[PDB]
C-alpha cells in the first residue's frame, strides 16, 4: 500500500468516533447533554424537525437518528453554531433511545501548538446515500487567536468536524478547506467556550 | 475500479458536450448564435483574432476552429464575459463551416436547490497540446443570489465550464476552485445576468 | 505508469535542487551569501538559533545544517522574508563547513508570461521526520505586478519554494495554494529585488 | 481528472450492460433464453436454487433476481460453464417477471485481432454488499485457438465477464487476470459455440 | 478519502501485529517458542546468523532484532519453511531481550470458507530502509486442500505473511500474488500442521 | 506528491533511454549494429518490413523510424528474439538517417545480486497513438541461471524492456509480469544467450 493521510474508519462505535454525528451535507459533534456543534454554513441548511444521525457507518448501523429542536448561532464572526436535539431518538441506537447514552462529548485540550499531530474526523462526502466516516491526520501549522490551521486532507463534508489532538481532546472545529493542504478551523477561545457552555441543554 | 467523481468524456460529439468550447487556457460554452460565455479572468488573456475550438477531443477531431470577433465583460461584479466568434470557421467541423451548425446551446434550468446533482463539463488542464474534456459530478451545496456552490473535483482549466443539472439544463458557469470533493464556485444566472447575456448574443 | 505533474526528486545534490533549503515546516531557497528567502508566515515560526538544512533527501544526506542569524520581513504587502544563516555549518555538507560552498543561488529570469512552463521545487509535506523534495510542473496562468499565478500541484510545505522557468531561472516565490490548481507566488518586481539585494549578508 | 482504463458504469439498464449478470462472487452474461455463461471456477461455488441478479447497480435497482436451475460445464479444457435460470423471477425487473424480457444476449463478432479495442464489462469486486458494474477497456494482444489475451485492468470478480468489441459484439469470456496487464479470456471457437448453442434452454 | 483494501498499520505493538516479523525481503510470523514461519523462496535467501526483526514500524521501534539458528523446509510441495531464532535478542524489544516475551503466536481457526473476510498482514515492499507493515483485507475465493485463494491487494514482500480471519485466527500463509486480485496462500492441512508442530523449538 | 516506483521519462534523447526502441505493442532495445532485442511473444506479431521507432517520446520526436529486415528467435526456451533493422532510416532522427548514429547499445553488467536496485525502461502501454517511455525501479528478488526476478511496476507493453543496474549496465530483458510492487520476470544473460546474441548481430 502507500502512505495516506486519510483513511476510512471501520468501526464508528468506539471513542472518539462516538462523539461525531452526520447531517445529510456535513458533520457535527457532541458538546454536552442533547447538544452538538457545527458551522453556521451548515446550520443555515437545517431547521427544527430535521434529522441528524449519531456516528453512522453505512449499513453497520449507527447510534440513532435524532431531531433538531433548537439552532443557536454564535454572535461573533467565527463559524460556530450550537444545535440541540430532542433527547428521545426517532430510531434507537444500540444503547437505547436516549441520545446521550449513545454518544460521548470530548474533553477540551489544554492548548495546541504548531507541529503537533491532529486528526479531523467527519463525513467528507456530502449528500450520499450512505454515511462513511474518514479520519484525516496532519500537523498544526498555526494557532492565532480563534484561528487554528492544520495541513490535512479535508473535503466539503468535513464542515463541522472536530479537530482532536493525539489524546482525542478537542482543539478546534473545522470549517473550511495526495492533498496535504492548509485547512482551517475555529480554535475555542474563552469567549467561544462561554457561548457554548451557555447554550448546552440543561 | 473505484468510485470517481471525475471522468474523461470519450465522445464529445454528442449533447451536452457539443455545447462546450476550448480556449488554450480555459473553457467556455455556447449561449446563442456565434456567442459563447466564459469568465472575465479568462477573456482578459484573449483578444480579437484569437482562436477557440468547438468540443475538441484530442485527435478525434472537433466541431471546428473559430476566431474571436468581440469580447464584452459583464458590468456587474460576477465573473462573466460574453465572447462572439466569426460565424465562418477557420477550420470546418463535421457539420460544415458554420459555427452554429456544429454546436448546441443549453436551455436554462427552472432553478437549482442544495443537494441536487450537477455536472461541470470542461477542459480542466490548461495549456496542453491536446484538448481533453472531463465531466465532474457532485451535489449543490448552496444557492444564494448569483452564487452557486457545489462539491466537486474542478481544476484551473475549468474556468468558464457550464454547470448543468441532471437533465443537461444550465444552472451556472464555473469560475473558481477556491480524491477531491471540494467546494467549487459558480455564477448562478439571475435575471440581471440573463438579460445582459440575451442583449449581447450576436444578432 | 501515469502522467503526473509532481514527482519526487531523487538526487537533490545537483542544480537546481542545490538552491533549495528545508525548514521543519516549509521551504526556502538561497538568494546570496549566507542568505535565503522564504514567506513571512514561515519566518513567524522561527527565531535566531533555529536550524535549516541545505537540499536534504531523506537519509541520502544533505548540504549541511545551518543556524538562523537574522530574519528580515519585507516591509511591503508581499509575502517575502529574507533569512541570513551563520556561514559555519552546525553539521557539514560534502563540500565542507561553509554554507556557500554547499549551495547555489539562482539567476533571475528576464520575465514571465502566461502559458510558459514553470517548476515549483520544495518540501511539500510539513513536520515530517525525513525531508523529501518534490518537483511540481505547470503553466503560468497570469503575471500582474508582484502576483504570479500558475497551475500546479502544490501543498502546505511548499510555502517558500522557488518558482523557476525551463532554464532554472527564478520567476517567483510560492506562498499559497490529480490536482492542477491555481497556485500563487510573489513575482519579483524591481522594488522586491531591491529589498532582497539590500539584505544579502555582506 | 486522468486517463483511466476502467470506469464505473452509471446506467446498467441500457445495452450492452443489460447482457451482464452478477453472482455474489463473480460475473456472467446472457447467451440465450434463460441461459447465461460463466467460468467453471465460478459455477463450482453455486448450486441449483442459488440466485443471480440481472444487471444490478447498487440501489438503482436491477433487471430482477433469478434462481439457477441447471449447471452444465464445458467438457473441454476451456474455462466455460453454461448456467440456466428459472424464467420466472424471484423478484421482478422493470420489464416484468420474465428473465428474457429484462436482459439482452450479444451477437458474436466475426472474429478478433491483435490491436483492436475491446471492453470487459463485469462486477470486479467479489462478495460486496452492493453490486457495482465497471467497464475495462484495452487492446487485444493475441488470439490463438481458444485463447484471447488483452491488456486491461481486470480484477477477481471479472471471472465470467463478456469481452466485447467496439460494436458490442462478443469476442470472448474473461477467466483470469494503473494496471495495464495481460488478461486472459476464452475465445469462442466453433467447438465452443456448438456446446453453448446445444445447452441454451429450449 | 476513498475505499481502500490496504492500509498502513500505525501501531504494530498490539495483537495481531505482534505476531508478525520482517526479513530484509519478505515477511514471516511466529508459530511457537523461538519459531517463525515463512515461504521456502524466502528462506533460500537466508542463512544461520542472518537477522529478523519483530513487528517493526519504521522509527517507532520494534520488538527486537533476533538471529536465525535453524531453517527447516517442509518436504511436500507447499511453500512452507520453519525458521528458529536464537531466543536471546541481538537488540532488545520493550519487553526485554527474550524473543518470546516480545511476540505472540496465533490460534489456528476452525476452518475457512469462500466469502469470509480475511486479512493479510505483512511488509509488502521488499529491501527498504524502513519497515512498514500493511494490512490487506478481502474475501476468501476458494479453499481446496492445501490451497487457499483470496481477493486482496498483496505485493512481493507479502511472501510469508499470515492470513487471518476476522477473529485474528490463522487460516493460511501467503506465498504468491485498485488491486482486488486473486492471491494465493497455503492452507494448513493436518500434514502441514504436523510438520510445523514437530519443528517448533522445544 | 507521493513515493512512486514508476515515472514518466521526460527526455528520451539521453542515455540510457537512447538504447530503447518502441514497437506498436511492446518494447525492445539495441544490442549492436542494426540489431535490437525483444521477446519471442512480441516478434511473433511482426514481420519483415514492419516498423520500429527509436526512443520516441510523444511529439517531442524520436531517433528515427526503421524497418525490420530479419527476425531470429533464440533456439533455447528463454523468451529472447533478435531483430535486425535496415540501417537506412525510413524517417531520420536528429543524428541523421543511420540507425546506429541515433541509438546506443548497453555494456553488460558483471552480474546481479538479490537486493540490488534495477530499472526497467520501456513503453508500458501497448497500441497507443503516442509513445510514452516510463522507468520502473525496484530490487532484484532472485537470480538463478537464466531467470532474474525483480519487484517492480511493469505492464503489458514492457515486454522486451531492458533491465539495468544503477550504473545503466544490462542485467536482463523483461518478458512477463506474471501501487504495484509485484514480482516481475526477466531473462538473465547467461553465457549461452550472450553467444547467440553476439552471433546474430548484423555484420
Ligand atoms: Cl496549501
Ligand atoms: Cl472544501
Ligand atoms: Cl483552481
Ligand atoms: Cl502484463
Ligand atoms: Cl485476479
Ligand atoms: Cl507479487
Ligand atoms: Zn504497497
Ligand atoms: Zn461558514
Ligand atoms: Zn497529490
Ligand atoms: Zn476495482
Ligand atoms: Zn475571475
Ligand atoms: Zn483524496
Ligand atoms: Zn502505466
Ligand atoms: Zn503569508
Ligand atoms: Zn484529481
Ligand atoms: Zn487532490
Ligand atoms: Zn485532471
Ligand atoms: Zn477456472
Ligand atoms: Zn500503475
Ligand atoms: Zn495496481
Ligand atoms: Zn474523500
Ligand atoms: Zn515459493
Ligand atoms: Zn485499480
Ligand atoms: Zn505530496
Ligand atoms: Zn513470451
Ligand atoms: Zn497499490
JSON list of N, CA, C and O in Angstrom, two decimals, chain F residues 14 17 20 22-23 41 47 52 81 86 94-95 102 105 120-121 123 126 135 158 176 180 186 192 202:
[
{"chain": "F", "resi": 14, "resn": "UNK", "atom": "N", "xyz": [18.55, 11.18, -24.09]},
{"chain": "F", "resi": 14, "resn": "UNK", "atom": "CA", "xyz": [19.80, 10.98, -23.39]},
{"chain": "F", "resi": 14, "resn": "UNK", "atom": "C", "xyz": [20.00, 9.54, -22.98]},
{"chain": "F", "resi": 14, "resn": "UNK", "atom": "O", "xyz": [18.99, 8.76, -22.90]},
{"chain": "F", "resi": 17, "resn": "UNK", "atom": "N", "xyz": [18.17, 6.07, -22.20]},
{"chain": "F", "resi": 17, "resn": "UNK", "atom": "CA", "xyz": [16.89, 5.93, -22.91]},
{"chain": "F", "resi": 17, "resn": "UNK", "atom": "C", "xyz": [17.13, 5.80, -24.46]},
{"chain": "F", "resi": 17, "resn": "UNK", "atom": "O", "xyz": [16.36, 5.19, -25.16]},
{"chain": "F", "resi": 20, "resn": "UNK", "atom": "N", "xyz": [16.66, 2.37, -26.12]},
{"chain": "F", "resi": 20, "resn": "UNK", "atom": "CA", "xyz": [15.37, 1.70, -26.12]},
{"chain": "F", "resi": 20, "resn": "UNK", "atom": "C", "xyz": [14.56, 2.04, -27.37]},
{"chain": "F", "resi": 20, "resn": "UNK", "atom": "O", "xyz": [14.58, 3.21, -27.87]},
{"chain": "F", "resi": 22, "resn": "UNK", "atom": "N", "xyz": [10.66, 1.36, -29.60]},
{"chain": "F", "resi": 22, "resn": "UNK", "atom": "CA", "xyz": [9.26, 1.00, -29.50]},
{"chain": "F", "resi": 22, "resn": "UNK", "atom": "C", "xyz": [8.74, 0.19, -30.68]},
{"chain": "F", "resi": 22, "resn": "UNK", "atom": "O", "xyz": [9.04, 0.52, -31.85]},
{"chain": "F", "resi": 23, "resn": "UNK", "atom": "N", "xyz": [7.96, -0.84, -30.36]},
{"chain": "F", "resi": 23, "resn": "UNK", "atom": "CA", "xyz": [7.08, -1.49, -31.29]},
{"chain": "F", "resi": 23, "resn": "UNK", "atom": "C", "xyz": [5.64, -0.95, -31.03]},
{"chain": "F", "resi": 23, "resn": "UNK", "atom": "O", "xyz": [5.42, -0.35, -29.97]},
{"chain": "F", "resi": 41, "resn": "UNK", "atom": "N", "xyz": [7.40, -13.60, -27.82]},
{"chain": "F", "resi": 41, "resn": "UNK", "atom": "CA", "xyz": [5.96, -13.28, -27.96]},
{"chain": "F", "resi": 41, "resn": "UNK", "atom": "C", "xyz": [5.63, -11.97, -28.54]},
{"chain": "F", "resi": 41, "resn": "UNK", "atom": "O", "xyz": [4.51, -11.71, -28.96]},
{"chain": "F", "resi": 47, "resn": "UNK", "atom": "N", "xyz": [6.80, -8.81, -38.72]},
{"chain": "F", "resi": 47, "resn": "UNK", "atom": "CA", "xyz": [7.45, -9.44, -39.87]},
{"chain": "F", "resi": 47, "resn": "UNK", "atom": "C", "xyz": [8.33, -8.43, -40.58]},
{"chain": "F", "resi": 47, "resn": "UNK", "atom": "O", "xyz": [8.25, -7.23, -40.33]},
{"chain": "F", "resi": 52, "resn": "UNK", "atom": "N", "xyz": [9.91, -0.09, -36.48]},
{"chain": "F", "resi": 52, "resn": "UNK", "atom": "CA", "xyz": [10.10, 0.22, -35.04]},
{"chain": "F", "resi": 52, "resn": "UNK", "atom": "C", "xyz": [10.54, 1.68, -34.99]},
{"chain": "F", "resi": 52, "resn": "UNK", "atom": "O", "xyz": [11.03, 2.24, -36.01]},
{"chain": "F", "resi": 81, "resn": "UNK", "atom": "N", "xyz": [14.32, -12.80, -28.67]},
{"chain": "F", "resi": 81, "resn": "UNK", "atom": "CA", "xyz": [14.39, -12.79, -30.11]},
{"chain": "F", "resi": 81, "resn": "UNK", "atom": "C", "xyz": [15.26, -11.61, -30.56]},
{"chain": "F", "resi": 81, "resn": "UNK", "atom": "O", "xyz": [15.16, -10.50, -29.98]},
{"chain": "F", "resi": 86, "resn": "UNK", "atom": "N", "xyz": [16.84, -2.44, -41.10]},
{"chain": "F", "resi": 86, "resn": "UNK", "atom": "CA", "xyz": [17.57, -1.69, -42.15]},
{"chain": "F", "resi": 86, "resn": "UNK", "atom": "C", "xyz": [18.24, -0.47, -41.56]},
{"chain": "F", "resi": 86, "resn": "UNK", "atom": "O", "xyz": [17.62, 0.34, -40.84]},
{"chain": "F", "resi": 94, "resn": "UNK", "atom": "N", "xyz": [17.54, 12.92, -35.13]},
{"chain": "F", "resi": 94, "resn": "UNK", "atom": "CA", "xyz": [18.31, 14.17, -35.15]},
{"chain": "F", "resi": 94, "resn": "UNK", "atom": "C", "xyz": [19.76, 13.96, -35.54]},
{"chain": "F", "resi": 94, "resn": "UNK", "atom": "O", "xyz": [20.44, 14.96, -35.94]},
{"chain": "F", "resi": 95, "resn": "UNK", "atom": "N", "xyz": [20.28, 12.75, -35.39]},
{"chain": "F", "resi": 95, "resn": "UNK", "atom": "CA", "xyz": [21.64, 12.44, -35.71]},
{"chain": "F", "resi": 95, "resn": "UNK", "atom": "C", "xyz": [21.73, 11.87, -37.15]},
{"chain": "F", "resi": 95, "resn": "UNK", "atom": "O", "xyz": [22.81, 11.52, -37.58]},
{"chain": "F", "resi": 102, "resn": "UNK", "atom": "N", "xyz": [21.90, 7.09, -34.09]},
{"chain": "F", "resi": 102, "resn": "UNK", "atom": "CA", "xyz": [20.80, 7.62, -33.25]},
{"chain": "F", "resi": 102, "resn": "UNK", "atom": "C", "xyz": [20.48, 6.79, -32.04]},
{"chain": "F", "resi": 102, "resn": "UNK", "atom": "O", "xyz": [19.54, 7.16, -31.28]},
{"chain": "F", "resi": 105, "resn": "UNK", "atom": "N", "xyz": [23.86, 1.10, -27.73]},
{"chain": "F", "resi": 105, "resn": "UNK", "atom": "CA", "xyz": [23.73, -0.17, -27.01]},
{"chain": "F", "resi": 105, "resn": "UNK", "atom": "C", "xyz": [24.29, -0.08, -25.56]},
{"chain": "F", "resi": 105, "resn": "UNK", "atom": "O", "xyz": [24.90, 0.90, -25.23]},
{"chain": "F", "resi": 120, "resn": "UNK", "atom": "N", "xyz": [13.65, -0.91, -15.02]},
{"chain": "F", "resi": 120, "resn": "UNK", "atom": "CA", "xyz": [13.08, -1.45, -16.27]},
{"chain": "F", "resi": 120, "resn": "UNK", "atom": "C", "xyz": [12.62, -0.26, -17.02]},
{"chain": "F", "resi": 120, "resn": "UNK", "atom": "O", "xyz": [11.80, 0.55, -16.54]},
{"chain": "F", "resi": 121, "resn": "UNK", "atom": "N", "xyz": [13.09, -0.10, -18.27]},
{"chain": "F", "resi": 121, "resn": "UNK", "atom": "CA", "xyz": [12.77, 1.11, -19.03]},
{"chain": "F", "resi": 121, "resn": "UNK", "atom": "C", "xyz": [12.08, 0.67, -20.28]},
{"chain": "F", "resi": 121, "resn": "UNK", "atom": "O", "xyz": [12.60, -0.21, -21.02]},
{"chain": "F", "resi": 123, "resn": "UNK", "atom": "N", "xyz": [8.06, 0.92, -22.93]},
{"chain": "F", "resi": 123, "resn": "UNK", "atom": "CA", "xyz": [6.83, 1.57, -23.31]},
{"chain": "F", "resi": 123, "resn": "UNK", "atom": "C", "xyz": [5.69, 0.71, -22.75]},
{"chain": "F", "resi": 123, "resn": "UNK", "atom": "O", "xyz": [5.31, -0.25, -23.41]},
{"chain": "F", "resi": 126, "resn": "UNK", "atom": "N", "xyz": [0.55, -0.70, -24.45]},
{"chain": "F", "resi": 126, "resn": "UNK", "atom": "CA", "xyz": [0.57, -1.09, -25.86]},
{"chain": "F", "resi": 126, "resn": "UNK", "atom": "C", "xyz": [-0.53, -0.50, -26.73]},
{"chain": "F", "resi": 126, "resn": "UNK", "atom": "O", "xyz": [-1.59, -0.13, -26.27]},
{"chain": "F", "resi": 135, "resn": "UNK", "atom": "N", "xyz": [10.04, 4.65, -16.61]},
{"chain": "F", "resi": 135, "resn": "UNK", "atom": "CA", "xyz": [11.14, 3.97, -15.90]},
{"chain": "F", "resi": 135, "resn": "UNK", "atom": "C", "xyz": [10.57, 3.39, -14.60]},
{"chain": "F", "resi": 135, "resn": "UNK", "atom": "O", "xyz": [10.00, 4.21, -13.76]},
{"chain": "F", "resi": 158, "resn": "UNK", "atom": "N", "xyz": [5.70, -3.56, -21.43]},
{"chain": "F", "resi": 158, "resn": "UNK", "atom": "CA", "xyz": [7.09, -3.66, -21.04]},
{"chain": "F", "resi": 158, "resn": "UNK", "atom": "C", "xyz": [7.75, -4.93, -21.58]},
{"chain": "F", "resi": 158, "resn": "UNK", "atom": "O", "xyz": [8.96, -5.06, -21.46]},
{"chain": "F", "resi": 176, "resn": "UNK", "atom": "N", "xyz": [7.82, -10.98, -18.63]},
{"chain": "F", "resi": 176, "resn": "UNK", "atom": "CA", "xyz": [6.45, -11.19, -18.11]},
{"chain": "F", "resi": 176, "resn": "UNK", "atom": "C", "xyz": [6.22, -10.48, -16.79]},
{"chain": "F", "resi": 176, "resn": "UNK", "atom": "O", "xyz": [7.12, -10.39, -15.99]},
{"chain": "F", "resi": 180, "resn": "UNK", "atom": "N", "xyz": [1.85, -0.88, -7.16]},
{"chain": "F", "resi": 180, "resn": "UNK", "atom": "CA", "xyz": [2.15, -2.25, -7.54]},
{"chain": "F", "resi": 180, "resn": "UNK", "atom": "C", "xyz": [3.65, -2.50, -7.42]},
{"chain": "F", "resi": 180, "resn": "UNK", "atom": "O", "xyz": [4.47, -1.93, -8.16]},
{"chain": "F", "resi": 186, "resn": "UNK", "atom": "N", "xyz": [12.34, -11.49, -15.80]},
{"chain": "F", "resi": 186, "resn": "UNK", "atom": "CA", "xyz": [13.29, -11.22, -16.90]},
{"chain": "F", "resi": 186, "resn": "UNK", "atom": "C", "xyz": [14.14, -12.45, -17.20]},
{"chain": "F", "resi": 186, "resn": "UNK", "atom": "O", "xyz": [14.15, -13.42, -16.42]},
{"chain": "F", "resi": 192, "resn": "UNK", "atom": "N", "xyz": [25.48, -18.78, -22.74]},
{"chain": "F", "resi": 192, "resn": "UNK", "atom": "CA", "xyz": [24.86, -19.32, -23.97]},
{"chain": "F", "resi": 192, "resn": "UNK", "atom": "C", "xyz": [23.98, -18.29, -24.71]},
{"chain": "F", "resi": 192, "resn": "UNK", "atom": "O", "xyz": [23.98, -18.20, -25.95]},
{"chain": "F", "resi": 202, "resn": "UNK", "atom": "N", "xyz": [24.06, -8.01, -36.73]},
{"chain": "F", "resi": 202, "resn": "UNK", "atom": "CA", "xyz": [24.41, -7.70, -38.16]},
{"chain": "F", "resi": 202, "resn": "UNK", "atom": "C", "xyz": [25.91, -7.33, -38.36]},
{"chain": "F", "resi": 202, "resn": "UNK", "atom": "O", "xyz": [26.47, -6.57, -37.57]}
]
